[PDB]
Design a protein around this ligand. Sequence first.
Ligand SMILES: Cc1nn(C)c(C)c1/N=N/c1ccc(/C=C/C(=O)NO)cc1
Ligand SMILES: Cc1nn(C)c(C)c1/N=N/c1ccc(/C=C/C(=O)NO)cc1
Ligand SMILES: Cc1nn(C)c(C)c1/N=N/c1ccc(/C=C/C(=O)NO)cc1
Ligand SMILES: Cc1nn(C)c(C)c1/N=N/c1ccc(/C=C/C(=O)NO)cc1
Ligand SMILES: [K+]
Ligand SMILES: [K+]
Ligand SMILES: [K+]
Ligand SMILES: [K+]
Ligand SMILES: [K+]
Ligand SMILES: [K+]
Ligand SMILES: [K+]
Ligand SMILES: [K+]
Ligand SMILES: [Zn+2]
Ligand SMILES: [Zn+2]
Ligand SMILES: [Zn+2]
Ligand SMILES: [Zn+2]
Lengths: 370, 370, 370, 370
Amino acid sequence: HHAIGYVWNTLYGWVDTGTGSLAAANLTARMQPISHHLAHPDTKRRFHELVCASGQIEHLTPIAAVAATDADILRAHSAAHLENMKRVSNLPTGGDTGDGITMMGNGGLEIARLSAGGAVELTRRVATGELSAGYALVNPPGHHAPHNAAMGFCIFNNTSVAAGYARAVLGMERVAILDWDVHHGNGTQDIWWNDPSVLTISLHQHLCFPPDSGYSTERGAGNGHGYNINVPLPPGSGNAAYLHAMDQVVLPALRAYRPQLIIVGSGFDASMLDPLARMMVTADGFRQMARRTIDCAADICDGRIVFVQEGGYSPHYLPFCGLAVIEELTGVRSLPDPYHEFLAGMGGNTLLDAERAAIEEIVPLLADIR
Amino acid sequence: HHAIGYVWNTLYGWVDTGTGSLAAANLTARMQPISHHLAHPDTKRRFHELVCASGQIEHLTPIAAVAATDADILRAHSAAHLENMKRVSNLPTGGDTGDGITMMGNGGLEIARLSAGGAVELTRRVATGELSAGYALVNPPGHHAPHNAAMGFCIFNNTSVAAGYARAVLGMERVAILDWDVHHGNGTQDIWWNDPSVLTISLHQHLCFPPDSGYSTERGAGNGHGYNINVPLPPGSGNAAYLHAMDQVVLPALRAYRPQLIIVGSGFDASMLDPLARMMVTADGFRQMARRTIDCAADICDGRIVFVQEGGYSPHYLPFCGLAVIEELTGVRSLPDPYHEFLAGMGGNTLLDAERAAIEEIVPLLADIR
Amino acid sequence: HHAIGYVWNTLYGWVDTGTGSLAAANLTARMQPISHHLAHPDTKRRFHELVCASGQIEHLTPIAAVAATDADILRAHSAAHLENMKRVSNLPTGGDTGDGITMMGNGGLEIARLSAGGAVELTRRVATGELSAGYALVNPPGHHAPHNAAMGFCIFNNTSVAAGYARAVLGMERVAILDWDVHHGNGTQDIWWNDPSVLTISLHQHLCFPPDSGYSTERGAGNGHGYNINVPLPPGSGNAAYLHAMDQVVLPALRAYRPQLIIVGSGFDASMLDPLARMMVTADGFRQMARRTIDCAADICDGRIVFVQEGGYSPHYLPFCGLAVIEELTGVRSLPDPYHEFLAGMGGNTLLDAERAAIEEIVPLLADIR
Amino acid sequence: HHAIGYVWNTLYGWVDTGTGSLAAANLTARMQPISHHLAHPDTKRRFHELVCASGQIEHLTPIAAVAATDADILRAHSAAHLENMKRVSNLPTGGDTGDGITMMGNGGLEIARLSAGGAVELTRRVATGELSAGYALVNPPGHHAPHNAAMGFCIFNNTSVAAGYARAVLGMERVAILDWDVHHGNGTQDIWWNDPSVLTISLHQHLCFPPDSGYSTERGAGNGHGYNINVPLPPGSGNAAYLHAMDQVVLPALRAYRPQLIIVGSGFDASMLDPLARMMVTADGFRQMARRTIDCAADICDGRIVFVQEGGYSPHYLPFCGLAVIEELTGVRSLPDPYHEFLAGMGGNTLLDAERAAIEEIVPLLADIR
Ligand SMILES: Cc1nn(C)c(C)c1/N=N/c1ccc(/C=C/C(=O)NO)cc1
Ligand SMILES: Cc1nn(C)c(C)c1/N=N/c1ccc(/C=C/C(=O)NO)cc1
Ligand SMILES: Cc1nn(C)c(C)c1/N=N/c1ccc(/C=C/C(=O)NO)cc1
Ligand SMILES: Cc1nn(C)c(C)c1/N=N/c1ccc(/C=C/C(=O)NO)cc1
Ligand SMILES: [K+]
Ligand SMILES: [K+]
Ligand SMILES: [K+]
Ligand SMILES: [K+]
Ligand SMILES: [K+]
Ligand SMILES: [K+]
Ligand SMILES: [K+]
Ligand SMILES: [K+]
Ligand SMILES: [Zn+2]
Ligand SMILES: [Zn+2]
Ligand SMILES: [Zn+2]
Ligand SMILES: [Zn+2]
């Protein structure tokens, strides 16, 4: 069976990231206002528009997002957090979600629900066999939000809401979340820390964000011990490092675990041109990562694979990274990466000793995935 | 003596970088138009506005840019190149300067002259002793433009026009250009390739831009052999690498050479948040680099040091990198880097073996600087 | 029958309006570059996104644009004009279409075809009875482009291509084009000047654009004499003037003519907040204009009415003006105009003597519509 | 004597107008966020940059803004209002100043002081005879702010702070404020309502903003009765109406009153391309208005005239309207209005009966100015 779901909702493009760069604009600090916050929604909107203008949309089955219910959110998060998000969204303007950085407008909860709900909807339709696989191009992102908070531009942990749904509603015994956003998926790690029924894997730049998080020694606890896998990589890591990590750690971990569904936290902030990390992945790197993961799903869980958008901050280049992943799902490879030659000469295509050793640190942990 | 020159001209902020991201927008390639090209002038304008709003401007002596004459430009470039820039600027709209990327509007030559002329003016006033040092916050940048072309957003090689002026007009026997823009200063290298009277030093990310350029083996030719020094560094290099390069190579090179004037090609594209390179320098790193270089000038050439803006593409963070350099010139350290704590945990502050070895490759070349 | 067609194509939002305000940026004239040209595609894209986010899209039947063929374009335009547009679009960076203002990128002809083609495809589906009515939210606009040229941001005359198709392909004897864009539809007037089989009506601000065009004395020629109707209105005209014009001139003209299809050139540049005209129409005014025209179509041509987007330059307010028209097509009135109270106190709601007299100048021309 | 003062402060360009269009962005109302609020500071910054790039700055004497003190503000406003602005600015992310529209960031009071202070500092230097006249290009604007509130984007009433200073500190008996911003100067009217020592004149579009304000019957009270003059004009009024108003009402009022200083509230929102009003004034119209008013000052108060920026919302055209006024102060007429021919054919250059009659309503009030 072949039918590829695609979720975009207009409101994903309407997320109000404010007038600051990262934190808010700040006169006393002389942080001048700017039109486009680093996380501004235009970056992901440009990905969507390229999906359409490239003609990939003709090969996709558009899937409507359905708002995550309170019950949906509560499988990933605390009632206190949900209540707090209702509270801040109910406030006449809106407010600070808690961390002095992640902000939500009046009614911004509507978009957070549609983002988590997009992941849930696609998960449902893939799990049932209506669809063979899909891509949920959601916004706001999810992977930093732990059980009890919003964090790092993330209100709810979209992939964990989807996993929680696959577990509780669809009765899946084993789900895997593979997160290749360049930042550590600390939220996802936190949510499933004590839980072996969701294998949580994060490839990331070591200590990029959050600080003091994502070490290889963070392995879960209790019955969940061994079912969280962090793959911290050095700044400057490129396609060779990322593919070595896939071949040596990620794919073996998935094969050992035998998930019934694979959810990919699909960020493109590891790209060669991203401002918010120092990695060197190209569109062709993301293509190969996607191909490998989709083929793994075909081998072990009847092709059941759901990509969910996480971060990525190059409005110029992210659309082509994203499109490459979409093309691997559809099998219609109809547009070149126009940056390919320009970026290919910059490097990242040789596995450096330091990169190899960082990856090899994780291989002995594979034996504890029962 | 203490009086610090500062050059900003309104037109530096009016450079038309077009509607593309890097190359032009391109419908057949599905490269969607965007408001801010990567090189858009707002990044450097925000630096200027911070110089003003921080109160640093009160400690600076504002210096008017004076348009570089044909004679000024001809000390760095060919008559053919100048003529070609007149031609493309004279064209009813403007056009492609030659490389399919570096574009100039009708009348855009006016800004190119004022940019090179800003560097010249400041060089004159520092060399005479009217000023002790300065910063020319110019735009468009210069260091990629070789003798016979425009390249990499550079129309004229501003620091080489300034050096050419110090040589031919002021009669200096020895000038040094230290380029710490993250990209290789191939233009500057080309211009002075056969010439020992201008020592050309470039610290850069190896093969970032241009491709196949900036190797340690590129050392000049003829009488100039030994008077070009490339310090290619690996992606991910941070403050520890950059300061080791300063201490082991740059400062010893300058001391060996005994220039009568130091010109710094001062880019901030090595910053932790730059999209166009993969380096990890913070505002505090640039501060220490500037402090070291200014102190070296004080020791060897009566404090005669002229900073000239090159690249840097983070409108968020570049202003604070720049301000740190301005503060080292003025000695008035009145504003924190508000990103300091956020970026300090990401790393780059330990000298990695690979970084150390890349730097040590250049140390044996120091003996050939007579 | 009730089924409402809606045409949006991603590329409508990708039209490259450049870096100028109206004409190009110009250094010698000191016209500083700006991110958003007055005609920037975001204004119409925001209308589309509101159609979606409001939930109106759920009550619409989305219709794919199909590229206008050469044969389609030739029913409205000269082979020389078509050839010239192919030429300018084929040029490496595109070029000037002829008038020193209307520019097209490399491949920009693709968007011009999809814009005219969107109008054609909706016309076909309404005429055939598949749909009862629709709105083609196209870009670039059309009504300034006469038979032999591009003009006023218009490459092809979309409504005249659609009328030409209804005439030649669908065999309609009588088609009406009602143009309420605030600028004179000089292109449409020119194309059908000698032709009584397309009644052309233009309500506009007198002499707003083009200059020296849109006088009441411009009435067609030969067999077409009496089948062009200009309704020039004074600056400051609001809802009362526009509705008086509809009731006294427009609707009687349509009833006299008995078209088999009504095409509306639907601009919103007559809005209270438009920079490019001085009129005072509110979303409620456009609503009433749309209601009247749709009801007229129901009375005289079996409800066959096709709206085709023309101008409008308020990204803030145009979406609400547009949405009001969409709501009158769907009959689902689910969102208020949030500017209603703010704009309603500004006036325009009383028929001034000068406005009344301007309208009454046209009423004696109604008797010559046979 | 001839020396023309000019006030620009970097922070005038840093006013955070937020992410809405006019009111804040609003998800439930489906008011999508936008990069440039209507009142965004770029419009005035572009005027400043044109003053520089045109070379007018070379003929001006740059004057540093000095922050308005509490004592300065209290000559125009209540202690409650000042205290409230301190409060809202002291709040962690700032807040709503009272009217649900006029917002101020944390520390935004700094800019409000520098704006009122810029007007004061220029007034001082002109009154004292150091300067003959000047232009204070301030932001935020002032004329809507009455004694006890912020309103219509205005935190403090800059011209009334300057008048209060001329009265109390410089001991002037009679000051005139002439406000040609297109909106009614209700704040200024309120502040001096009972006071004959400040003649307050407002030319505006009738009922544009505020609603139900600016009628000819609003004439002051007590000893101030007859010393407030409103000239409400109809939508569509252009150069002919504005110049007739100057010749019939404004200039005679000033001659009758014999002020010792004229302060002009200089908005350009009456321009032909402004989104926030429906008037037809061109740069040449503003030029003639400025020429007349400066010549009047020369005749009656030793040339003592201070222009203070109010509104204006066309980033495209406002700079040229502003430059024309600057050119009349300097007497150096070195740049054309590049929109002149394009806008001159649109009209406004004939005095319509309705415009004439609106103006003539005010002429009998001239006899009560003693
Ligand atoms: C802390 C802190 N303090 N300040 C002052 C600032 C400006 C801080 N940055 N927070 C950040 C910055 C970036 C991210 C990116 C997340 C992502 O891409 N996820 O996948 C998250 C949080
Ligand atoms: C080649 C090529 N081909 N294409 C298609 C593209 C998009 C190309 N990029 N060119 C570039 C890109 C970046 C720079 C930065 C320079 C700098 O920061 N200097 O200090 C220069 C040239
Ligand atoms: C001519 C000319 N010459 N110059 C110098 C300039 C600045 C010119 N304006 N061109 C324009 C300006 C506006 C429109 C609006 C069209 C619309 O809304 N259509 O319905 C069209 C052409
Ligand atoms: C009230 C209100 N309510 N609502 C709902 C809205 C959208 C409101 N507009 N406020 C405004 C709108 C424009 C101005 C222009 C001022 C200027 O040019 N000064 O000279 C001031 C206030
Ligand atoms: K787990
Ligand atoms: K990750
Ligand atoms: K050399
Ligand atoms: K360099
Ligand atoms: K006709
Ligand atoms: K019209
Ligand atoms: K008064
Ligand atoms: K006024
Ligand atoms: Zn991320
Ligand atoms: Zn660079
Ligand atoms: Zn129009
Ligand atoms: Zn105003």
